[PDB]
Design a binder for these strands. Structure first.
Ligand SMILES: [Ca+2]
Ligand SMILES: [Ca+2]
Ligand SMILES: [Ca+2]
Ligand SMILES: [Ca+2]
Ligand SMILES: [Ca+2]
Ligand SMILES: [Ca+2]
Ligand SMILES: [Ca+2]
Lengths: 127, 128
DNA sequence: AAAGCCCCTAGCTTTTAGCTATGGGGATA
DNA sequence: AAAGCCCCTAGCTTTTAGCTATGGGGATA
DNA sequence: ATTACC
DNA sequence: ATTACC
């Protein structure tokens, strides 16, 4: 199952994890549900397919298929950036002793249908 | 085993495949060896780790770890663009029998340690 | 120590903001 | 038909080149 | 204003 | 000028 843009046929799926500033346990309750809505809205607007997404109290997991030419960091900057603006506009406690909602950092890991040990079998390495 | 730049901790591995123009079986002999020489130079110069690379006459496989902020496309653009420029200077048959060495297209497939269905179940069951 | 904390610039969105950049500099303990 | 074929612009490298762009048009017939 | 998700 | 890469 592969998508394509004008020039690239691709399957670029990323496991994305980022945490709030100071790793606060704020991704619960109304903030959690509203965070998921904003990300879903960003993905739709940016042509990103959210395969799975779930918060875990002080961090969020996202499994997203992103156009490799568009860039994974552009989706991440947009997701974290807009969600920070809106959630801090809608939830005052997200500005209390919080200079920002997110950190400058995140975790990214590529994911495919086949694991890495299987895909290396596709290729006879000539190094 | 994860890497990190200034802000991102990542493991971004891509199975990349692209073919010569018209799918001509030109990736043999000295063209094959010289092509892999140039991509090694591009990888080292662009901080890209080449896990595995194989040419097979009419296509090249590359399994590579690429900085996600740098972008998989900037590596592909440089690897294809520079190899096309150099090999067409050094092999007359590549400059006279083809308008370009490569096509405008490629294949990109991400890969990690776990299968997709396992990561999917793992993310879905986070809240218990 | 760093990804995560503090500090800085510049770029681009979310712009009397708040995230990136294969971005930089630190102490704390 | 499209990723792959022919055409284009525009950005950046490899620059009396040749690749990208979440880029566009099209015929094959 | 932090302390760790893979 | 192509026809498909575990
Ligand atoms: Ca096209
Ligand atoms: Ca978790
Ligand atoms: Ca192998
Ligand atoms: Ca093979
Ligand atoms: Ca830094
Ligand atoms: Ca640590
Ligand atoms: Ca086809």
């Amino acid at each position: 199952l592969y998508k394509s843009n004008h020039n690239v046929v691709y399957s670029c799926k990323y496991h994305i994890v980022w945490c709030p500033k100071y790793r606060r346990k704020v991704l619960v309750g109304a903030v959690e549900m509203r965070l998921k809505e904003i990300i879903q809205e960003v993905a739709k607007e940016l042509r990103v397919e959210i395969i799975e997404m779930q918060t875990d109290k002080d961090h969020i997991h996202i499994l997203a298929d992103i156009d490799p030419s568009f860039g994974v960091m552009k989706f991440i900057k947009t997701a974290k950036g807009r969600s920070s603006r809106i959630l801090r506009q809608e939830f005052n406690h997200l500005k209390t002793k919080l200079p920002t909602l997110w950190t400058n950092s995140c975790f990214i890991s590529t994911v495919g249908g086949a694991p890495l040990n299987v895909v290396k079998q596709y290729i006879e390495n000539q190094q």
